[PDB]
Design a binder for this molecule. Structure first.
Ligand SMILES: O/N=C/c1ccc(-c2ccc(O)cc2)c2ccccc12
Ligand SMILES: O/N=C/c1ccc(-c2ccc(O)cc2)c2ccccc12
Lengths: 228, 10, 225, 10
């Protein structure tokens, strides 16, 4: 399978556009947070279907499949959020009916810090002019590189997605030096996505413990498993 | 088992 | 500054190894924690000096320098640890006289998990056959990428080191396609290094709250951030 | 603060 057709499969694995079905309304501490958790739970369901569409993922042992998704889910959610917000500076496009900014993050202690991190990393991807195909590969790599008979197969798959990202970049027609430079800049931003997701999980766990937000069955399981 | 149910059904 | 000059500058800047002796009696949770923390504290002093040698670092605002170091210190420390352990498989070479085995992590509840991660990641660098000069660039990239117009300058500094890593890889002679793949493979390990540092950091903060060990001076300050 | 001392005073 060529890098081009592997990227086509990632395009085909892409989850649908998700809405929370919320009537436009000023956000408050309670509605904002219930909206974020309600959205994450819905996106998690589609994330599972997405991963199974990545060629070879279902051939991994069940234990590896579960382990990869339990560790990278918040990062994959945030990477998706950044792509969606790339053409909307100053905004975080969680969904069509859930567009949030900074002064709205102020309404909940500890959220503003996370919104600022998300906004800054998004701005970085915007400056690099992240392309859709690059986003597809990076997102898949976050899943496959979140590892912390089947193991061998995982390495083959990660190498395949890496080969595809390299192909996407070579296709842009820029100089070889510029291609390596771009490859490095994109990969390095992953640490920033990882950082934001780690703070995102820390905040959610505290909200679960305080029962401030209803924690949706799958979201809760994914949260507890990851934390554990 | 919620993650596992979804990983084994379509 | 050319890529080679930057690599040579990092080579010279490499901190000298800190010497620490292994306790006389067998390790106890306390003697092991005292050994790791005493070492870290000493390595942190040399790390600051190392940072000031990275071309352009001292030109950043003081508040940026402090912010970068506060964010990446454990990751930088573990990257060094793994490099020192590269040629002694199954072992972690904290210092010449402090060679800890995966199993000796048993005495400290929660440590074994960290030792396992570090060893596994070390194995991966061994598998990729990480070279000294690639290691020098990567460790400096860890510091400059911890962005967790002085920011223009930071981006420019990181690009310079990235540039040198590409140069080092091109110097290995492999095909252009393979050069791109090796660069990717090397940077993709930064998540793993960062994971271990987050766990070591959480472990350390908690060992502090329990006063299972004294955490002050340079180490403490760096811990709070 | 120790960190600032080593960065600027040392
Ligand atoms: O306690 N706060 C928890 C919490 C839960 C979920 C998200 C999130 C939702 C959808 C998405 O695509 C990415 C991230 C959050 C995003 C930012 C701060 C806190 C979040
Ligand atoms: O509570 N856990 C504390 C703790 C503190 C420091 C280190 C460390 C020392 C020297 C070095 O070069 C890298 C990392 C640790 C390494 C592994 C587990 C726990 C550590």
């Amino acid at each position: 399978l060529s890098p081009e057709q592997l990227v086509l499969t990632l395009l085909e694995a892409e989850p649908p556009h998700v809405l929370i079905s919320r009537p436009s309304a000023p956000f408050t501490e309670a509605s904002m947070m219930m909206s974020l958790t309600k959205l994450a739970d819905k996106e998690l369901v589609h994330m599972i279907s997405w991963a199974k569409k990545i060629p070879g993922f279902v051939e991994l042992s069940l234990f590896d499949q579960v382990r990869l998704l339990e560790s990278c889910w918040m990062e994959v959610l945030m990477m998706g959020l950044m792509w969606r917000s790339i053409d909307h500076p100053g905004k975080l496009i969680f969904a069509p009916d859930l567009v949030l900014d900074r002064d709205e993050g102020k309404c909940v202690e500890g959220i503003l810090e996370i919104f600022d991190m998300l906004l800054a990393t998004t701005s970085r991807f915007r400056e690099l002019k992240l392309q859709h195909k690059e986003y597809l590969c990076v997102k898949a790599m976050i899943l496959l590189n979140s590892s912390m008979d089947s193991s061998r197969k995982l390495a083959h798959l990660l190498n395949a997605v890496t080969d595809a990202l390299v192909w996407v970049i070579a296709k842009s027609g820029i100089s070889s030096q510029q291609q390596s430079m771009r490859l490095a800049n994109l990969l390095m931003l992953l640490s920033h996505v990882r950082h934001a997701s780690n703070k995102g999980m820390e905040h959610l766990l505290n909200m679960k413990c305080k029962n401030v937000v209803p924690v949706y069955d799958l979201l809760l399981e994914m949260l507890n498993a990851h934390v554990l | 088992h919620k993650l596992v149910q979804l990983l084994t059904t379509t």
